[PDB]
């Protein structure tokens, strides 16, 4: 059941989840093609486009999924799984809101499974940097989606 409020609550909840994960990761440490908003997407004030922005939100969130799957193997297994599962609900909500149309693109499964093994073959240091970069980038994307959705 979709509501702007439920979508807003879902983003805000995942953001607090990312924060709590970043905290329980930065106490052991103390390129990637991650989704990122650009002006052309229509999510910022300058060149704001409702239709293209909603497509970029759903696309970016579907692309982030391989990276959230990576986080699951990387002791608070319930917390990292909760981030992944809470994201899937966010995608469903936005797919339901966009019910007017879909022309995305959805990512290739075998390309993701290969990227996943490549990320899992790195040493522990690189794996901790990968985690930091995934979490920061996902936070940046969710914060822009949050701002944009308010006007859509």
């Amino acid at each position, epitope marked *: 059941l979709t509501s702007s*409020e439920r979508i807003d609550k879902q983003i805000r909840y995942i953001l607090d989840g990312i924060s709590a994960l970043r905290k329980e990761t930065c106490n052991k440490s103390n390129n990637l093609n991650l989704p990122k908003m650009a002006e052309k997407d229509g999510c910022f004030q300058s060149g704001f486009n409702e239709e293209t922005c909603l497509v970029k939100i759903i696309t970016g969130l579907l692309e982030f999924e391989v990276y959230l799957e990576y986080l699951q193997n990387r002791s608070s297994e319930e917390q990292a799984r909760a981030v992944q599962m809470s994201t899937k609900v966010l995608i469903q909500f936005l797919q339901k809101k966009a019910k007017n149309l879909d022309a995305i693109t959805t990512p290739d499964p075998t390309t993701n499974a290969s990227l996943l093994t490549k990320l899992q073959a790195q040493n522990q240091w690189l794996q901790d940097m990968t985690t930091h970069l995934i979490l920061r980038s996902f936070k940046e994307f969710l914060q822009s989606s949050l701002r944009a959705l308010r006007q859509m």
Partner: antibody
Amino acid sequence: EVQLVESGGGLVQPGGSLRLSCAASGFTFSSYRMYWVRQPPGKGLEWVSAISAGGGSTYYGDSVKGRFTISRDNAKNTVYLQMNSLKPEDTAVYYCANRAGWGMGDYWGQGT
Amino acid sequence: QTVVTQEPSLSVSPGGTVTLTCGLSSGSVTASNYPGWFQQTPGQAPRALIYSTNDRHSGVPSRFSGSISGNKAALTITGAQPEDEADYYCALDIGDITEFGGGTHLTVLG
């Protein structure tokens, strides 16, 4: 500064039709959700309807859902409130506004 | 159907502190409800004071402040002035819509 000018309300017969306009100036109109609030005589504030930045999404109060229609226009920077099947219960001062965003707060007009 | 609840009337003495609350029947008020506070002087158009829970509108005195305390949205006036005697309407974004509370008549004593 930012300005919002409501027009053109008036006397109308029950079951009648009216079209409200809201001329916006001084802000990136195409980048904001716009909304309408009504104030019946001697009564509190009542939310009427809302329109997303590009008009894709429209929302209404369940006491006017079937009767009212919200529309938007750019580069004319105007929002409209098409009011059909008008009832004495719709007698009020009508205000247009922008939802906060991009470092700006909710600005309301003078009313019609 | 959700109900936005606010105290019908409240009062304060000059230079005193007063808190106006705004709540839901369907549970707790969160950041997602983007609470707004509007001041209305008689025969005048409403003026937005606080937006997005705690953000102050252009030219709003620093004595007016917003927050969420408990399960409700709150408006605190620190060092009330005679000019602060007015109606205060709260607005919460519930579902896909926005709902105003009945409003609070604040009297500055006495």
